[PDB]
Design a protein around this ligand. Structure first.
Ligand SMILES: [Cl-]
Ligand SMILES: [Cl-]
Ligand SMILES: [Cl-]
Ligand SMILES: [Cl-]
Ligand SMILES: [Cl-]
Ligand SMILES: [Cl-]
Ligand SMILES: [Cl-]
Ligand code: NA
Length: 129
């Protein structure tokens, strides 16, 4: 599924991401825009052989099982395919664990490089939330 900007803001708020770990909804919408372009089916292979999955590009190195990332963990206790669903519940649940792990949203390098410190409220501007 390819979400619209306000459609995703609303789904993230329904699943309790808004202000989770003090990160306003615009931070989450901006991270999703640059990780996946709002596409739940986004996948990207990393040079180390891990793969990033879904709207928030969650990495198989630590967070989900894809069976092809040697020495990896599965700390969200999910198949990485669950992160590609039209329903974002598994991505949001896992994202809550990642953002709790100690470095906040810096875990998402695209958030650090493209969202952090910017006018992230623009991402929810106009949205009926
Ligand atoms: Cl957009
Ligand atoms: Cl915001
Ligand atoms: Cl594996
Ligand atoms: Cl594990
Ligand atoms: Cl699995
Ligand atoms: Cl959803
Ligand atoms: Cl933080
Ligand atoms: Na894994």
């Amino acid at each position: 599924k390819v979400f619209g900007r306000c459609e995703l803001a609303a789904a993230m708020k329904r699943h309790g991401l808004d202000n989770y770990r003090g990160y306003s909804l615009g931070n989450w919408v901006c991270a999703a825009k640059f990780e996946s372009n709002f596409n739940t089916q986004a996948t990207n292979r990393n040079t180390d052989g891990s793969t990033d999955y879904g709207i928030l590009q969650i990495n198989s190195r630590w967070w989900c099982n894809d069976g092809r990332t040697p020495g990896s963990r599965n700390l969200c206790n999910i198949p990485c395919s669950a992160l590609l669903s039209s329903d974002i519940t598994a991505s949001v649940n896992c994202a809550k664990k990642i953002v709790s792990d100690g470095n906040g949203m810096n875990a998402w390098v695209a958030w650090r490089n493209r969202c952090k410190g910017t006018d992230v409220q623009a991402w929810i501007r106009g949205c009926r939330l």
